[PDB]
Design brief:
about 270 residues; alpha+beta; Phosphorylase Kinase, domain 1; Transferase(Phosphotransferase), domain 1; 2 domains; 12 strands; about 20% strand; binds the ligand O=C1Nc2cncc(n2)OCCCCCOc2ccc(Cl)cc2N1; protein serine/threonine kinase activity; isopeptide bond; ubl conjugation; protein domain specific binding
């Protein structure tokens, strides 16, 4: 093999948070770029399982709209996860406050988001924290689902496992997660995708959380689509949202049917 092809340099920090930091790494020889997730296994009681699970789920992921997994390295209290580098950055940064983005762009991103989610659900995995800060873009603006630190298996040996753990981000989480003890995984991911669609078309989130105690949510259930946040959304995509953001998870539209929706199949718009 070629010498030095094992050394990667840290060019700059891409992201950071509770886990630690995400640095950009470039190969010394090939100059290939990849994202490195730096997680400090500090303390032993909420880590040996955390980082090890995310790694476990990643070794299963292989789809064009999902961040690719290259491998990991262990060193004392420092774990290294080599992930796909998406120079496009976060979807969140393509959303203009109070405005959103051109409908055609939002539709394409939505299609790709759906492709990824279909793949994941197809192999029994639920992301559980879909939001614009976790949806990355590559050089060609192709959407890719990232960060599987909250992900979990909801189907194994063809048997579905209801979830009970409450995770995600309040503005994006479905109502059943805040009202029921157990719930189906898939409708939860569909709901969050609906909130992401709203953000892309209005540049604002509809509510702090999906509870009847939150004024804006109540107004949604009452169909007050005038003026309020939904006023900036054309009737075609708004009709899709009316089917995604349904409180009863059992009545909520599923992905196969979202793919049959008028706006979803509308040329351009
Ligand atoms: O290039 C990547 N890859 C990647 C792959 N998997 C996870 C992850 N990052 O970080 C978690 C997402 C949030 C930080 C935001 O991360 C980024 C921010 C800005 C750019 Cl240009 C790239 C990334 N990320």
């Amino acid at each position: 093999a070629v010498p030095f092809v094992e050394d990667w340099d840290l060019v700059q920090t891409l992201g950071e948070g509770a886990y630690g930091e995400v640095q950009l790494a470039v190969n010394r020889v090939t100059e290939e770029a990849v994202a490195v997730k730096i997680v400090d296994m500090k303390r032993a009681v909420d880590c040996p399982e955390n980082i090890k699970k995310e790694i476990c789920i990643n070794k299963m992921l292989n789809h064009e709209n999902v961040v690719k997994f290259y491998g990991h390295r262990r060193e004392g209290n420092i774990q290294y996860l080599f992930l796909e580098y998406c120079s496009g950055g976060e979807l969140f940064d393509r959303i203009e406050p109070d405005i959103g983005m051109p409908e055609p762009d939002a539709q394409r991103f939505f299609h790709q988001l759906m492709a990824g989610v279909v793949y994941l659900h197809g192999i029994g995995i639920t992301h559980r924290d879909i939001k614009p800060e976790n949806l990355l873009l590559d050089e060609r603006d192709n959407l890719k689902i990232s960060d599987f630190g909250l992900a979990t298996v909801f189907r194994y040996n063809n048997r579905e496992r209801l979830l009970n753990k409450m995770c995600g981000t309040l503005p994006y989480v479905a109502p059943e997660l805040l009202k029921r003890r157990e719930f189906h995984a898939e409708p939860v991911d569909v709901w969050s995708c609906g909130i992401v669609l709203t953000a892309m078309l209005a540049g604002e989130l509809p509510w702090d959380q999906p509870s009847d105690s939150c004024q804006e949510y109540s107004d949604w259930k009452e169909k007050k689509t005038y003026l309020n946040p939904w006023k900036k959304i054309d009737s075609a995509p708004l009709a899709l949202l009316h089917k995604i953001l349904v409180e009863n998870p059992s009545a909520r539209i599923t992905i196969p049917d979202i793919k049959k929706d008028r706006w979803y199949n509308k040329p351009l718009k």
